Amino acid sequence: SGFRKMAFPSGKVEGCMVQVTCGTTTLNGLWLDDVVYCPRHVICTSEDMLNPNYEDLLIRKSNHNFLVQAGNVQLRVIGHSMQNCVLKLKVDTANPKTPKYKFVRIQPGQTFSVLACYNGSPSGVYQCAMRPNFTIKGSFLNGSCGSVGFNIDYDCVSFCYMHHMELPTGVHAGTDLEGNFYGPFVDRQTAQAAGTDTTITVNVLAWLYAAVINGDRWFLNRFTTTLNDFNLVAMKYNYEPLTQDHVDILGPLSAQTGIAVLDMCASLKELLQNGMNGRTILGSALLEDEFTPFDVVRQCSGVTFQ
Amino acid sequence: SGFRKMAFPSGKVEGCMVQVTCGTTTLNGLWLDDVVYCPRHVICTSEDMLNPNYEDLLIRKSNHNFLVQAGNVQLRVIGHSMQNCVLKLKVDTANPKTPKYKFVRIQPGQTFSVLACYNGSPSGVYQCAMRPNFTIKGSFLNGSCGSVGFNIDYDCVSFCYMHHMELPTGVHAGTDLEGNFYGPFVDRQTAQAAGTDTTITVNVLAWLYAAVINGDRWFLNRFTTTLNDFNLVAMKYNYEPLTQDHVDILGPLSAQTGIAVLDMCASLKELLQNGMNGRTILGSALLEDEFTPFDVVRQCSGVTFQ
Ligand SMILES: *[C@H](O)[C@H](C[C@@H]1CCNC1=O)NC(=O)[C@H](CC(C)(C)C)NC(=O)OCc1ccccc1
Ligand SMILES: *[C@H](O)[C@H](C[C@@H]1CCNC1=O)NC(=O)[C@H](CC(C)(C)C)NC(=O)OCc1ccccc1
C-alpha cells in the first residue's frame, strides 16, 4: 500500500535526448530514427525573440549552422524543415536506442511524466497534469526547452509534450510533438498570460478512492446526492462539471471500494463546504486533482512496463 | 522556475533490474557485474515466514533452485551466499549495463529515488525521504521486494535502499545494500511497528527557501529569534532540534535569498503557532519536510547527470 505521485521509468526517453546548438542558443532535442525534434526558437537570438518571422529566419539557415551533440558524438545535420513550432533536423545516423513510439496529443485533465533536461542531459523526472487552461505546473529553468513529456504503455512511449516557455505566473507552456501549442500561446515574447483555471473534479474523486483503498476513511459519510445537485456545488467552488462519462470511468474504483460514485460526490461536497478541519488525506491538507482514475488503478494494482 | 518533487532519471538502474524466483516466491533482484542482490526472504515459504532460521534454510538450497530472469534471457546461478538480510547470487554473466556505482548507507532526513518494480520490470519512479524513525513513506505492493532506492552523482549510482516489507501503519522498511536494516526491524512476520516520528526541521527551512526563490513570500516577517528560542518551539511541535551545522548547510540558500537563517526560523515559528490561515506554500497546505537543502539547490539551479 501507499500512494505517491509517480513518474514512468525514464530510461527509454533518456536515450533519445540530445543537445542542439544554433548560434547563441542551446536547448534540448529528441532524437528518433534519423530526425532530431526541437523547439523552433533555437534559430532565434535575443532580439529576434520580440516578434520574429521564423520562415524568414529559417531560409537564412544552413545545415552546418545546427550543432547536434549526442553525448560526446557529434551529429551531422543533412536537412532541416519546420513543422509548426518545432524543427525537424534530419541527421545522418538513426538513433539505435529508438523505442517504439507514438506522437499523441493529450486532453486537459490527463497526466504525463516530464524528463527535465539541460544541455541534452537528463536532470530529473516528475509527473504533471495538463491543466484545464492548457498550462502545466512544472519545474523548468533556462536551457530546459525541448524537454519532453510522455506516457509509457507496455513498451511504447507516447510523447505528448515538448517544453517551450514559462508564463508570468510561473506555469509552463509547450506544444505537442507535431509543434502545435497546447492552449492560446505563441512562441514569442509578448504579454501572454495563463487565464483562469479550474479544478479537475473527476481526478479529485479518483484520489478520494485512492485514499479509501489506502485506509483513509474519515471523510466518508452516509449521505448521497444527485449528479445535478453535486454540479451546482462544483460550479460554486470552481470545480469543473462532472459528466456521466466521468461517473462511468470511476466505476471500477467504485466497485473495488463498494462506495457508489454519487456517494463519494456527497463526501466531496462536504469537504468543499466544511474544509478538512485540520485533517489530511494521503498526506495532503488539500484536495488533490493531478491523479487520473487510470493513475489510481495503475498504482493501486501494480502495472509495469517492458 | 517552479518546484516539484523530482526523482533522478532511472535509466541506469532499470538496466540492472531482474526477476528472482525460488519456489513459490517471486521478487526483484539487482544485477551488478556477475552478482544478483535480492532480499533473503525469497528462500522462504508462507509458513517459513513466521519465525525462520535463514542459515538452516539456505544450506538446504541448491544453485538450480534460483531462477533468475533478465528480461527474456535466463540467468544461470553458479554460487550463492547470504550477507545479513540480502542474498548474493553469483551468475555466469556480468551485466553489460553495470553503471559505475557505490553502496552507501543514508542518514534519516536524506532523500533518494525509488524505482518500483514487479517481476523484474520497472513500474514507476518517485522520491522518498528516510524518516527519523527509519521508515519510508513509499508505494509498494506484493512483489515489489528487491526494488531499490538510489541517488545519482554525475555518472555514479549510489544505491542506498532495498525494499523488504510494509509495517502496520502503511509505511515501509528495508535494508541498505549490504543487507543491514534501517531501524529496529527484522525480516520476519512479527508484531513490529514504526514507533514515533518527528518532522525534519532543516528540510522544512530548505523548502521555505525554495518557496522564496519561486516567489512565495507571504510567510516572511521582520522578526528574528535565537537558535535556542527556536528550538523550544521546535520541541513543542515535535520538530527535531536545529543544530549549528544545519544553519551552516542552509548558508547558501540564505545568501541567495538575503534571508538570514534565524529569520526564516522566526517565520517557521509563526507558521507553527498560527498555521497558514487558508494559504499555501508551493502548492501545499502543509509544511513539507522531504526536500533537503541539496535537493533545493539542485532543482533551483539545474544540475544534470551523465
Ligand atoms: C527555453 O529553454 C526557455 C524555457 C524557459 C526559461 C525559464 N523557464 C522556462 O520554462 N524558454 C524561453 O526562454 C522562452 C523563449 C521564447 C519566448 C519561446 C522564444 N521565453 C520565456 O519562457 O520567457 C519567460 C521567462 C524566461 C526566463 C525566466 C523566466 C521566465
Ligand atoms: C515483498 O514483496 C513484500 C513487500 C510488501 C508487500 C506489501 N507491501 C510491501 O511492502 N514483503 C513482504 O511481504 C514481507 C515479507 C517478510 C516479512 C519480509 C518475510 N511481509 C510484509 O510486508 O507484511 C506486511 C504486509 C504484507 C502484505 C500486505 C500488507 C502488509
Measure the CA–CA gap between B265 and A232, rounded to whole angstroms: 43
Measure the CA–CA gap between A26 and A210, rounded to whole angstroms: 42
> Residues A44, A85, A145, A265: which is the catalytic one?
A145
Which residue on chain B is closest to A154 by alpha carbon? B123
What resolution in angstroms, rounded to 1 decimal?
1.9
Q: Which atom of ligand 1 approaches the CA of B1 most closely? A: 8
A-chain residues near B143 (CB < 8 A): 302
The string over A137-169, giving b where at least 16 C-beta atoms fall within 10 Å of a residue's C-beta and e elsewhere, is bbbbeebbbbbbbbbbeeeebbbbbbbbbbbee
Atom 11 of ligand 1, residue of closest alpha carbon: A165
> Domain B198-301 is of which CATH architecture?
Orthogonal Bundle (1.10)
**A124, B305 Cβ separation under 8 angstroms:** no
Which of A166, A171, A185 best tests ligand 1's pocket when mutated (most atoms within 8 Å of CB)? Answer: A166
For residue B156, indicate whether it is catalytic.
no
Ligand 2 centre to CA of B156 (Å) is 30
Tell me if chain B has a CB within 8 Å of the CB of A199.
no
Give the other-Cβ count within 10 Å of B277's Cβ. Answer: 8
Place of cell 533519445: A16
B9 is written with which cell numbers?
532519471
Q: Length of chain A in residues, anyone?
A: 306
First to last CA, chain B: 23
Measure the CA–CA gap between A130 and A139, rounded to whole angstroms: 14
Technique of determination: X-ray
A6, A12, A113, A297: best mutation site toward chain B, by most B Cβ within 10 Å? A6
A-chain residues near B304 (CB < 8 A): 117-119, 121-123
Q: In terms of Cα–Cα distance, which of A111, A105, A139 is closest to A291?
A: A111
Measure CA B259 to chain center.
30
B300 is written with which cell numbers?
533551483
Domains A1-14+100-197 and A15-99 share a fold: yes
Strands A148-153 and A121-129: unpaired
Tell me if chain B has a CB within 8 Å of the CB of A99.
no
**A94, A120 Cβ separation under 8 angstroms:** no
Atom 11 of ligand 2, residue of closest alpha carbon: B165
What phi, psi does B82 have (nearest 5°)?
-110, 135
A-chain residues near B292 (CB < 8 A): none
A45 is written with which cell numbers?
537570438
Measure CA B93 to chain center.
29
The domain locations on chain A are: 1-14+100-197, 15-99, 198-301
**B29, B36 Cβ separation under 8 angstroms:** yes
Strands A100-103 and A156-166: parallel
B8 is written with which cell numbers?
533522478
- CB-CB under 8 Å, B137 with A2: yes
B294 is written with which cell numbers?
541539496
> Residues A16, A38, A41, A172: which is the catalytic one?
A41
Measure the CA–CA gap between A12 and B279, rounded to whole angstroms: 39
Q: In terms of Cα–Cα distance, which of A278, A295, A117 is closest to A200?
A: A295
Which of B145, B147, B188, B192 best tests ligand 2's pocket when mutated (most atoms within 8 Å of CB)? Answer: B145
Measure the CA–CA gap between A118 and A29, rounded to whole angstroms: 10
A-chain residues near B294 (CB < 8 A): none
Instruction: Kindly report the three-state secondary structure assignment for every residue of chain B.
Output: CCCCCCECCCHHHHCCEEEEEECCEEEEEEEECCEEEEEHHHHCCCCCCCCCCHHHHHHCCCHHHEEEEECCEEECEEEEEEECCEEEEEECCCCCCCCEEEECCCCCCCEEEEEEEECCEEEEEEEEECCCCCCECCCCCCCCCCCEEEEEECCEEEEEEEEEEECCCCCEEEECCCCCECCCCCCCCCCCCCCCCCECHHHHHHHHHHHHHCCCCCCCCCCCCCHHHHHHHHHHCCECCCCHHHHHHCHHHHHHHCCCHHHHHHHHHHHHHHCCCCCCECCECCCCCCCCHHHHHHHCCCCCCC
Measure the CA–CA gap between A124 and A122, rounded to whole angstroms: 6
Measure the CA–CA gap between B184 and B29, rounded to whole angstroms: 23
The size of the A-B interface in CB pairs under 8 A is 157
**B201, B265 Cβ separation under 8 angstroms:** no
Distances (CA, A) of B114 to A168, B141, B286, B293: 33, 13, 23, 19
Measure CA A101 to chain center.
17
For residue B172, indicate whether it is catalytic.
no
> Domain A1-14+100-197 is of which CATH architecture?
Beta Barrel (2.40)
Measure the CA–CA gap between B79 and B66, rounded to whole angstroms: 10
Ligand 2 centre to CA of B164 (Å) is 7
Measure CA A11 to chain center.
18
Tell me if chain B has a CB within 8 Å of the CB of A214.
yes
Tell me if chain B has a CB within 8 Å of the CB of A280.
yes
Which of B22, B25, B142 best tests ligand 2's pocket when mutated (most atoms within 8 Å of CB)? Answer: B142
Longest CA span, chain A: 69
Measure CA B62 to chain center.
33
What phi, psi does A74 have (nearest 5°)?
-85, 170
Measure CA B110 to chain center.
8
Q: Mind giving me the DSSP string for chain A? A: ------BPP-HHHHTTEEEEEETTEEEEEEEETTEEEEEGGGG--TTTTSS--HHHHHHT--GGGEEEEETTEEE-EEEEEEETTEEEEEESS--TTPPEEEE--PPTT-EEEEEEEETTEEEEEEEEE--TTS-B-----TT-TT-EEEEEETTEEEEEEEEEEE-TTS-EEEE-TTS-BSSS--SSSSS-------B-HHHHHHHHHHHHHTT--TT--S----HHHHHHHHHHTTBPPPPHHHHHHTHHHHHHHT--HHHHHHHHHHHHHH--TT--BTTBSS------HHHHHHHTTT----
Atom 24 of ligand 2, residue of closest alpha carbon: B166
B 53-92 residues with CB < 8 A to A: 71
**B209, B264 Cβ separation under 8 angstroms:** yes
Q: Length of chain B in residues, anyone?
A: 306
Strands B66-70 and B73-75: antiparallel
B3, B6, B19: best mutation site toward chain A, by most A Cβ within 10 Å? B6
Tell me if chain A has a CB within 8 Å of the CB of B10.
yes
Q: What CATH number does the domain located at A15-99 have?
A: 2.40.10.10
Give the other-Cβ count within 10 Å of A246's Cβ. Answer: 20
A184 is written with which cell numbers?
492560446
A 172-191 residues with CB < 8 A to B: 172
Ligand 1 centre to CA of A188 (Å) is 10
